[PDB]
Short mmCIF file of N, CA and C and ligand atoms in Angstrom, two decimals:
data_model
loop_
_atom_site.label_atom_id
_atom_site.label_comp_id
_atom_site.label_asym_id
_atom_site.label_seq_id
_atom_site.Cartn_x
_atom_site.Cartn_y
_atom_site.Cartn_z
N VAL O 1 110.52 90.35 133.42
CA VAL O 1 110.26 89.03 134.43
C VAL O 1 109.48 87.63 133.24
N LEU O 2 110.73 86.84 132.93
CA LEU O 2 110.33 85.95 132.21
C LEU O 2 109.21 85.13 132.43
N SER O 3 107.82 84.61 131.59
CA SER O 3 107.39 83.48 132.18
C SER O 3 107.95 82.05 132.28
N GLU O 4 107.46 81.15 133.22
CA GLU O 4 108.05 80.18 133.14
C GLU O 4 107.83 79.17 131.68
N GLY O 5 106.87 79.69 130.81
CA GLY O 5 107.28 78.64 129.73
C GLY O 5 108.51 79.67 128.60
N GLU O 6 108.36 80.62 128.99
CA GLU O 6 110.14 81.40 128.18
C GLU O 6 110.98 80.69 129.00
N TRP O 7 111.28 80.44 130.05
CA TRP O 7 112.17 79.67 130.82
C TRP O 7 112.22 78.86 130.08
N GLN O 8 111.39 77.82 129.86
CA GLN O 8 111.17 76.49 129.51
C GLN O 8 112.40 76.53 128.11
N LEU O 9 111.60 77.57 127.07
CA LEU O 9 111.92 77.44 125.93
C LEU O 9 113.74 77.64 125.87
N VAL O 10 114.07 78.42 127.41
CA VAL O 10 115.77 79.01 127.25
C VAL O 10 116.57 77.37 127.51
N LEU O 11 115.97 77.01 128.66
CA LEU O 11 116.69 75.95 129.41
C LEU O 11 116.38 74.72 128.16
N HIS O 12 115.35 75.05 127.22
CA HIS O 12 115.49 73.73 126.20
C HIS O 12 116.76 73.78 125.35
N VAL O 13 116.68 74.94 124.80
CA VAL O 13 117.77 74.73 123.90
C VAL O 13 119.30 75.00 124.33
N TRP O 14 118.97 75.54 125.95
CA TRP O 14 120.57 75.13 126.45
C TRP O 14 120.74 73.87 127.06
N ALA O 15 120.11 73.51 126.98
CA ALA O 15 120.60 71.61 127.67
C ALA O 15 120.95 71.38 126.23
N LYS O 16 120.60 71.39 124.82
CA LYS O 16 121.38 71.17 123.66
C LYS O 16 123.11 71.65 123.67
N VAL O 17 123.09 72.77 124.51
CA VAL O 17 124.49 73.43 124.08
C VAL O 17 125.55 72.62 125.14
N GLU O 18 125.30 72.20 125.77
CA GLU O 18 125.78 71.67 126.80
C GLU O 18 126.14 69.97 126.67
N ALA O 19 126.42 69.40 125.39
CA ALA O 19 126.42 68.63 124.62
C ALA O 19 127.98 68.81 123.87
N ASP O 20 128.36 70.23 123.68
CA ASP O 20 129.09 70.14 123.32
C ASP O 20 129.87 71.81 123.84
N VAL O 21 129.44 71.74 125.09
CA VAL O 21 130.13 73.45 125.61
C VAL O 21 130.92 74.06 124.71
N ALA O 22 132.45 73.30 124.59
CA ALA O 22 133.74 74.00 124.35
C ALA O 22 133.73 74.40 122.63
N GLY O 23 133.01 73.53 121.82
CA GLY O 23 132.58 74.04 120.47
C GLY O 23 131.68 75.45 120.70
N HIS O 24 130.59 75.77 120.95
CA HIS O 24 129.75 76.75 120.97
C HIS O 24 130.61 77.91 121.79
N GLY O 25 131.38 77.65 122.95
CA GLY O 25 132.21 78.86 123.39
C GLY O 25 133.29 79.32 122.53
N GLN O 26 133.73 78.65 121.74
CA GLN O 26 134.82 78.94 120.37
C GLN O 26 133.91 79.63 119.43
N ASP O 27 132.56 79.02 118.84
CA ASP O 27 131.71 79.93 117.90
C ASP O 27 131.71 80.74 118.17
N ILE O 28 131.16 80.94 119.75
CA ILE O 28 130.38 82.32 120.26
C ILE O 28 131.90 83.99 120.61
N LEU O 29 133.11 83.34 121.13
CA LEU O 29 134.25 83.95 121.24
C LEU O 29 134.35 84.66 120.10
N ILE O 30 134.75 83.81 118.76
CA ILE O 30 135.20 84.23 117.70
C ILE O 30 134.18 85.34 116.90
N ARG O 31 132.89 84.90 116.89
CA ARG O 31 131.85 85.59 116.59
C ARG O 31 132.02 86.87 116.89
N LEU O 32 132.06 87.07 118.24
CA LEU O 32 132.27 88.46 118.87
C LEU O 32 133.67 89.11 118.61
N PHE O 33 134.81 88.42 118.47
CA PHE O 33 136.16 89.16 118.30
C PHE O 33 135.78 89.83 116.94
N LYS O 34 135.40 88.63 115.91
CA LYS O 34 135.25 88.93 114.42
C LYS O 34 134.20 90.40 114.24
N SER O 35 133.04 90.30 114.76
CA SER O 35 132.12 91.19 114.77
C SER O 35 132.29 92.51 115.42
N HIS O 36 133.21 92.42 116.41
CA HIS O 36 133.37 93.67 117.20
C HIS O 36 135.03 93.65 117.62
N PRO O 37 135.87 93.66 117.01
CA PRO O 37 137.20 93.91 117.39
C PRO O 37 137.68 94.44 118.74
N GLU O 38 137.05 95.22 118.87
CA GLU O 38 137.54 95.99 120.38
C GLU O 38 137.27 95.50 121.26
N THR O 39 136.33 93.84 121.47
CA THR O 39 136.09 93.06 122.52
C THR O 39 137.74 92.69 122.71
N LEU O 40 137.88 92.05 121.20
CA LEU O 40 139.21 91.14 121.73
C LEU O 40 140.79 92.12 122.47
N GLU O 41 140.23 92.97 122.21
CA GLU O 41 141.17 94.55 122.42
C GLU O 41 141.35 94.13 124.12
N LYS O 42 139.93 94.03 124.92
CA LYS O 42 139.93 93.94 126.15
C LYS O 42 140.42 92.35 126.97
N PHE O 43 141.33 91.56 125.62
CA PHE O 43 141.52 90.69 126.61
C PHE O 43 143.28 90.37 126.20
N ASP O 44 144.26 90.65 127.19
CA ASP O 44 145.82 90.35 126.88
C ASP O 44 146.19 89.30 126.33
N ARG O 45 145.13 88.22 127.07
CA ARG O 45 145.21 86.43 126.89
C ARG O 45 145.31 86.39 125.26
N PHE O 46 144.43 87.18 124.59
CA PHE O 46 144.08 86.58 123.06
C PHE O 46 144.23 87.85 122.07
N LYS O 47 144.89 88.63 122.50
CA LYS O 47 145.33 90.02 121.41
C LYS O 47 145.73 89.62 120.33
N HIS O 48 146.90 88.61 120.66
CA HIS O 48 147.88 88.19 119.75
C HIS O 48 147.43 87.37 118.55
N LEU O 49 145.82 86.91 118.51
CA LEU O 49 145.38 86.04 117.47
C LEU O 49 144.75 86.98 116.25
N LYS O 50 145.10 86.83 115.26
CA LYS O 50 145.07 88.05 113.95
C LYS O 50 144.04 87.28 112.87
N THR O 51 143.45 86.22 112.97
CA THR O 51 142.85 85.47 111.79
C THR O 51 142.23 84.70 112.93
N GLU O 52 140.97 84.16 112.10
CA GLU O 52 140.09 82.81 112.43
C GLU O 52 140.38 81.85 112.89
N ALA O 53 141.49 81.73 112.03
CA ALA O 53 142.18 80.23 111.56
C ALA O 53 143.33 80.08 113.14
N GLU O 54 143.78 81.11 113.55
CA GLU O 54 144.36 81.44 114.31
C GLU O 54 143.56 81.33 116.08
N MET O 55 142.53 82.20 116.15
CA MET O 55 141.64 81.53 117.35
C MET O 55 140.84 80.34 117.27
N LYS O 56 140.64 79.61 115.97
CA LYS O 56 140.18 78.74 116.08
C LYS O 56 141.13 77.27 116.57
N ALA O 57 142.29 77.92 116.76
CA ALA O 57 143.29 76.69 116.75
C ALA O 57 144.18 77.12 118.49
N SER O 58 143.49 78.21 118.99
CA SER O 58 143.79 78.37 120.32
C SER O 58 143.04 77.85 121.28
N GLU O 59 143.84 76.60 122.40
CA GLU O 59 143.37 75.84 123.11
C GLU O 59 143.00 77.23 124.70
N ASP O 60 143.40 77.70 124.25
CA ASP O 60 143.77 78.39 125.46
C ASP O 60 141.85 79.56 125.22
N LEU O 61 142.03 79.99 124.15
CA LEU O 61 140.60 80.63 123.86
C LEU O 61 139.46 79.58 124.13
N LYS O 62 139.69 78.11 123.81
CA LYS O 62 138.68 77.38 124.34
C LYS O 62 138.35 77.27 124.89
N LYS O 63 139.18 76.89 126.39
CA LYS O 63 139.17 77.08 127.63
C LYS O 63 137.92 78.09 127.76
N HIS O 64 138.50 79.38 128.03
CA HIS O 64 137.62 80.17 128.17
C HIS O 64 136.44 80.21 127.74
N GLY O 65 136.35 80.17 126.28
CA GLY O 65 134.98 79.95 125.68
C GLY O 65 134.39 78.88 126.99
N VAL O 66 134.28 77.82 127.62
CA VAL O 66 133.86 76.93 128.73
C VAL O 66 133.42 77.74 129.91
N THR O 67 134.49 78.55 130.33
CA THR O 67 134.78 79.05 131.58
C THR O 67 133.14 79.93 131.52
N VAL O 68 133.39 80.95 130.14
CA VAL O 68 131.94 82.28 129.64
C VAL O 68 130.71 81.18 130.25
N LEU O 69 130.69 80.23 128.75
CA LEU O 69 129.47 79.16 129.26
C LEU O 69 128.95 78.45 130.14
N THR O 70 129.63 78.15 130.90
CA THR O 70 129.79 77.19 131.79
C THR O 70 129.01 78.51 133.04
N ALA O 71 129.30 79.94 133.54
CA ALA O 71 129.01 80.48 134.01
C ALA O 71 127.53 80.91 133.62
N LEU O 72 127.38 81.26 132.26
CA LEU O 72 126.31 81.64 131.72
C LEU O 72 124.87 80.71 132.58
N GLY O 73 125.73 79.56 131.91
CA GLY O 73 124.44 78.25 132.05
C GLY O 73 123.94 78.28 133.37
N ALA O 74 125.00 78.49 134.55
CA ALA O 74 124.48 78.26 136.08
C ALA O 74 123.84 79.85 136.17
N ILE O 75 124.14 80.90 135.39
CA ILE O 75 123.21 81.94 135.53
C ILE O 75 121.69 81.63 135.17
N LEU O 76 121.48 80.96 133.70
CA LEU O 76 120.33 80.67 133.28
C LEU O 76 119.20 79.67 133.83
N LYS O 77 119.83 78.76 134.90
CA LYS O 77 119.36 77.63 135.51
C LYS O 77 118.80 77.94 136.48
N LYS O 78 119.11 79.32 137.03
CA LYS O 78 118.70 80.28 138.29
C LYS O 78 117.13 81.13 137.71
N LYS O 79 116.88 80.79 136.78
CA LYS O 79 115.74 81.69 136.20
C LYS O 79 115.52 82.77 136.56
N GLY O 80 116.36 83.58 136.60
CA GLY O 80 116.28 84.96 137.20
C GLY O 80 116.38 85.02 138.34
N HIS O 81 116.28 84.12 139.28
CA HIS O 81 116.84 84.22 141.08
C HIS O 81 118.36 84.01 140.70
N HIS O 82 119.51 84.80 139.97
CA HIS O 82 120.59 84.94 140.24
C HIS O 82 121.71 85.71 140.54
N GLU O 83 121.22 86.51 141.50
CA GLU O 83 122.27 87.21 142.29
C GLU O 83 123.46 87.03 142.74
N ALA O 84 123.12 85.53 143.10
CA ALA O 84 124.85 85.21 143.75
C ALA O 84 125.51 84.72 143.07
N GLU O 85 125.06 84.62 141.57
CA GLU O 85 125.85 84.35 140.22
C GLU O 85 126.06 85.61 139.76
N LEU O 86 125.24 86.54 139.91
CA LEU O 86 125.79 87.68 139.15
C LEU O 86 126.58 88.67 139.95
N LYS O 87 126.91 88.64 141.37
CA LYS O 87 127.33 89.89 142.15
C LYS O 87 128.69 89.64 141.42
N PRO O 88 129.45 88.38 141.72
CA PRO O 88 130.77 88.58 141.28
C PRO O 88 130.95 89.01 140.08
N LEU O 89 130.62 88.61 139.11
CA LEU O 89 130.95 88.42 137.33
C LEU O 89 130.89 89.73 137.60
N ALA O 90 129.64 90.50 137.96
CA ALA O 90 129.87 92.18 137.63
C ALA O 90 130.61 92.70 138.51
N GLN O 91 131.32 92.44 139.52
CA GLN O 91 132.13 93.12 139.96
C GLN O 91 133.57 93.24 139.68
N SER O 92 133.45 91.48 138.59
CA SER O 92 135.12 91.39 137.87
C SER O 92 134.91 92.27 136.65
N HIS O 93 133.95 92.22 136.23
CA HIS O 93 134.11 92.82 134.51
C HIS O 93 133.72 93.73 134.80
N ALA O 94 133.44 94.75 135.84
CA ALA O 94 133.12 96.27 135.97
C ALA O 94 134.80 96.69 136.63
N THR O 95 135.08 96.04 137.40
CA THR O 95 136.17 96.85 138.07
C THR O 95 137.40 96.46 137.41
N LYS O 96 137.97 94.96 137.29
CA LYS O 96 139.02 94.49 136.70
C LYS O 96 138.88 94.11 135.16
N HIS O 97 138.36 93.47 134.49
CA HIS O 97 138.47 93.54 133.44
C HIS O 97 137.73 94.64 132.67
N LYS O 98 136.88 95.61 133.46
CA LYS O 98 136.83 96.75 132.39
C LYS O 98 136.02 96.98 131.20
N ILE O 99 134.90 95.74 131.39
CA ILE O 99 134.33 95.59 130.21
C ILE O 99 132.64 96.43 130.00
N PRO O 100 132.38 97.11 129.47
CA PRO O 100 131.40 97.66 129.48
C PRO O 100 129.78 97.42 128.88
N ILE O 101 128.70 97.53 129.64
CA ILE O 101 127.66 97.23 129.17
C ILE O 101 127.06 96.83 127.54
N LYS O 102 127.58 97.80 127.22
CA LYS O 102 127.40 97.40 125.67
C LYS O 102 128.22 96.17 124.78
N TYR O 103 129.23 95.92 125.62
CA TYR O 103 130.12 94.66 125.37
C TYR O 103 129.31 93.26 125.21
N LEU O 104 128.50 93.62 126.49
CA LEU O 104 127.83 92.25 127.15
C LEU O 104 126.56 92.50 125.92
N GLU O 105 125.99 93.34 125.65
CA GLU O 105 125.06 93.09 124.38
C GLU O 105 125.38 92.27 123.06
N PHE O 106 126.94 93.03 122.72
CA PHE O 106 127.65 91.88 121.41
C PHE O 106 127.57 90.41 121.92
N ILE O 107 128.34 90.16 123.08
CA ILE O 107 128.34 88.91 123.36
C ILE O 107 126.91 87.96 123.65
N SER O 108 125.96 88.84 123.91
CA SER O 108 124.39 88.29 123.44
C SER O 108 123.77 88.08 122.20
N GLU O 109 124.20 88.70 121.31
CA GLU O 109 124.01 89.01 119.86
C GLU O 109 124.98 87.26 119.38
N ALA O 110 126.29 87.74 119.77
CA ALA O 110 126.95 86.23 119.37
C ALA O 110 126.60 84.86 120.06
N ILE O 111 125.71 85.00 121.33
CA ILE O 111 125.40 83.76 121.56
C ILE O 111 124.06 83.38 120.76
N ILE O 112 123.32 84.27 120.65
CA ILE O 112 122.03 84.43 119.83
C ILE O 112 122.23 83.24 118.31
N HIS O 113 123.07 84.04 117.86
CA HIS O 113 123.53 83.35 116.53
C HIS O 113 124.08 82.64 116.33
N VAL O 114 125.53 81.97 117.15
CA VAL O 114 125.41 80.52 117.50
C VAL O 114 124.29 79.52 117.81
N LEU O 115 123.82 79.79 118.92
CA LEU O 115 122.54 78.49 119.06
C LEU O 115 121.47 78.66 117.70
N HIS O 116 121.05 79.60 117.05
CA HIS O 116 120.17 79.52 115.76
C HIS O 116 121.10 78.55 114.83
N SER O 117 122.62 78.82 114.79
CA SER O 117 123.38 78.03 113.86
C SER O 117 123.17 76.41 113.66
N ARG O 118 123.69 75.95 115.42
CA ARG O 118 123.39 74.81 115.80
C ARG O 118 122.22 74.21 116.44
N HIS O 119 120.92 75.07 116.95
CA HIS O 119 119.75 74.44 117.10
C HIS O 119 118.78 74.74 116.47
N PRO O 120 118.34 74.56 115.11
CA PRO O 120 117.52 75.68 114.64
C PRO O 120 116.48 74.49 114.96
N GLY O 121 116.05 73.75 115.26
CA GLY O 121 114.54 73.01 115.12
C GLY O 121 114.35 73.36 116.75
N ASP O 122 115.13 74.16 117.70
CA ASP O 122 114.84 73.96 119.31
C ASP O 122 115.01 75.70 119.44
N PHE O 123 115.53 76.38 118.34
CA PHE O 123 115.52 78.04 118.28
C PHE O 123 114.92 78.62 117.22
N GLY O 124 113.57 78.53 117.01
CA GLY O 124 112.65 79.16 116.55
C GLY O 124 112.25 80.19 117.12
N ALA O 125 111.55 81.08 116.63
CA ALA O 125 111.34 82.59 116.84
C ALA O 125 110.66 82.79 118.75
N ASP O 126 110.02 81.46 118.67
CA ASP O 126 109.36 81.87 120.34
C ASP O 126 110.98 81.47 121.09
N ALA O 127 111.52 80.39 120.88
CA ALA O 127 112.94 80.19 121.73
C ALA O 127 113.88 81.42 121.62
N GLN O 128 113.91 82.34 120.07
CA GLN O 128 114.80 82.99 120.13
C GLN O 128 114.27 84.19 121.01
N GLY O 129 113.51 84.72 121.34
CA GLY O 129 112.54 85.62 121.99
C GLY O 129 112.63 85.55 123.31
N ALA O 130 112.35 84.49 123.54
CA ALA O 130 112.57 84.12 125.24
C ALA O 130 114.31 83.99 125.40
N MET O 131 115.33 83.79 124.59
CA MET O 131 116.61 84.25 125.04
C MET O 131 116.90 85.23 125.14
N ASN O 132 116.54 85.96 124.01
CA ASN O 132 116.86 87.56 124.01
C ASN O 132 116.28 87.90 125.12
N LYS O 133 115.25 87.73 126.05
CA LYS O 133 114.40 88.39 127.20
C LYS O 133 115.74 87.94 128.29
N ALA O 134 115.78 86.69 128.29
CA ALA O 134 116.89 85.99 129.56
C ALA O 134 118.19 86.68 129.36
N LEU O 135 119.00 86.99 127.97
CA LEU O 135 119.96 87.60 128.04
C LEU O 135 119.81 89.31 128.74
N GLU O 136 118.95 89.68 127.77
CA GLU O 136 118.16 90.96 128.72
C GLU O 136 118.43 90.93 130.09
N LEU O 137 117.69 90.39 130.50
CA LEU O 137 117.43 90.20 132.00
C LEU O 137 119.01 90.18 132.91
N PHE O 138 120.15 89.31 132.23
CA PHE O 138 121.12 89.21 133.05
C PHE O 138 121.87 90.77 132.49
N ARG O 139 121.70 91.45 131.19
CA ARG O 139 122.57 92.77 130.96
C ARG O 139 121.57 93.67 132.04
N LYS O 140 120.34 93.82 132.17
CA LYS O 140 119.85 94.71 133.19
C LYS O 140 120.60 94.70 134.75
N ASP O 141 120.34 93.20 135.09
CA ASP O 141 120.74 92.94 136.01
C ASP O 141 122.30 93.30 136.73
N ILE O 142 123.06 93.25 135.75
CA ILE O 142 124.67 93.39 135.71
C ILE O 142 124.72 94.78 135.68
N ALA O 143 123.75 95.47 135.10
CA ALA O 143 124.27 97.02 134.69
C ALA O 143 123.64 97.76 136.13
N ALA O 144 122.50 97.40 136.75
CA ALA O 144 122.65 97.76 137.83
C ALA O 144 123.65 98.09 138.77
N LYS O 145 123.88 96.47 139.12
CA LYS O 145 125.62 96.42 139.83
C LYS O 145 126.69 97.39 139.51
N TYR O 146 127.19 97.58 137.83
CA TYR O 146 127.67 98.50 137.40
C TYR O 146 127.44 99.83 137.91
N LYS O 147 126.00 100.27 138.14
CA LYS O 147 125.79 101.52 138.54
C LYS O 147 125.76 101.99 139.50
N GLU O 148 125.76 101.10 140.70
CA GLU O 148 125.94 101.25 142.00
C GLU O 148 127.86 101.65 142.00
N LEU O 149 128.74 100.79 141.13
CA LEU O 149 129.87 101.06 141.65
C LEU O 149 130.59 102.36 140.68
N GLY O 150 129.81 102.87 140.01
CA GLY O 150 129.97 103.96 139.50
C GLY O 150 130.74 103.31 137.80
N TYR O 151 130.09 102.66 137.07
CA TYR O 151 130.67 101.86 135.84
C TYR O 151 129.71 102.25 135.08
N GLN O 152 128.42 102.35 135.22
CA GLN O 152 127.49 102.33 134.12
C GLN O 152 127.87 103.14 132.60
N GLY O 153 128.27 104.29 133.23
CA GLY O 153 128.56 104.99 132.32
C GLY O 153 127.62 106.18 131.46
C1 HEM Z 1 128.25 85.83 128.72
C2 HEM Z 1 129.07 87.09 129.35
C3 HEM Z 1 130.04 86.81 129.88
C4 HEM Z 1 130.38 85.90 130.96
C5 HEM Z 1 129.39 85.14 131.53
C6 HEM Z 1 131.49 86.02 131.24
C7 HEM Z 1 132.18 85.07 132.18
C8 HEM Z 1 133.56 85.25 132.63
C9 HEM Z 1 134.10 84.42 133.70
C10 HEM Z 1 133.58 83.41 134.72
C11 HEM Z 1 134.99 84.39 133.93
C12 HEM Z 1 136.25 84.69 134.89
C13 HEM Z 1 135.85 84.85 136.24
C14 HEM Z 1 136.31 86.62 136.69
O1 HEM Z 1 136.93 86.87 136.03
O2 HEM Z 1 135.46 86.94 136.49
C15 HEM Z 1 136.08 85.91 133.22
C16 HEM Z 1 136.69 86.70 132.75
C17 HEM Z 1 136.85 87.65 131.81
N1 HEM Z 1 136.14 88.24 131.25
FE1 HEM Z 1 134.06 87.53 130.85
N2 HEM Z 1 132.17 86.85 130.61
C18 HEM Z 1 131.20 87.22 130.05
C19 HEM Z 1 131.26 88.61 128.96
C20 HEM Z 1 132.65 88.88 128.69
C21 HEM Z 1 133.00 90.31 127.58
C22 HEM Z 1 131.76 90.50 126.67
C23 HEM Z 1 134.36 90.50 127.56
C24 HEM Z 1 135.09 91.18 127.11
C25 HEM Z 1 134.69 91.63 125.79
C26 HEM Z 1 135.10 89.77 129.05
C27 HEM Z 1 135.88 89.97 129.12
C28 HEM Z 1 136.69 88.80 130.28
C29 HEM Z 1 138.50 88.96 130.72
C30 HEM Z 1 138.93 90.02 130.12
C31 HEM Z 1 138.29 88.09 131.84
C32 HEM Z 1 139.84 87.54 132.30
C33 HEM Z 1 140.33 86.67 131.25
C34 HEM Z 1 141.74 86.47 131.38
O3 HEM Z 1 142.60 86.94 131.02
O4 HEM Z 1 141.61 85.16 131.91
N3 HEM Z 1 133.96 88.99 129.60
N4 HEM Z 1 134.68 85.99 132.04
#
């Protein structure tokens, strides 16, 4: 359970993201695909992209980055009271998209790295630890839903 002070750190940096949701979503997905190429393979939509320049030039990738970060922002702003938002995401990522929990750890790492690059003055160690906790909570709660459905592994 995050404290109120931890949530403030999380949402203070997240407010900086929402000034350029699409740029962040590109940096995060590109980092994810470059660092963990098995993740790109999960997107039939993106698996034709073979270079970082091709990734940066894809408008469809940029659109999807906004979809992802809009859904994560709505979850973070619930401060843990996010059951309604996770149900559907867990269900589609477990049963339709077939995304292992481990790849949610990978995209969490990408999110933290991009927030540190773009917002260092609002993403010192205290905020980095709080955002790590918030993403852990996200993963823990998605993982319990995966387990229910037979996908925790
Ligand atoms: C912060 C973590 C994530 C969030 C908030 C998120 C959110 C979403 C949302 C809102 C959608 C569209 C609605 C739906 O299908 O449920 C979607 C689609 C999808 N996601 Fe995620 N996602 C996350 C992580 C991942 C990861 C790590 C992968 C793959 C490694 C992935 C793979 C997919 C795929 C394959 C689709 C369908 C894309 C398409 O072909 O249109 N997601 N995601």
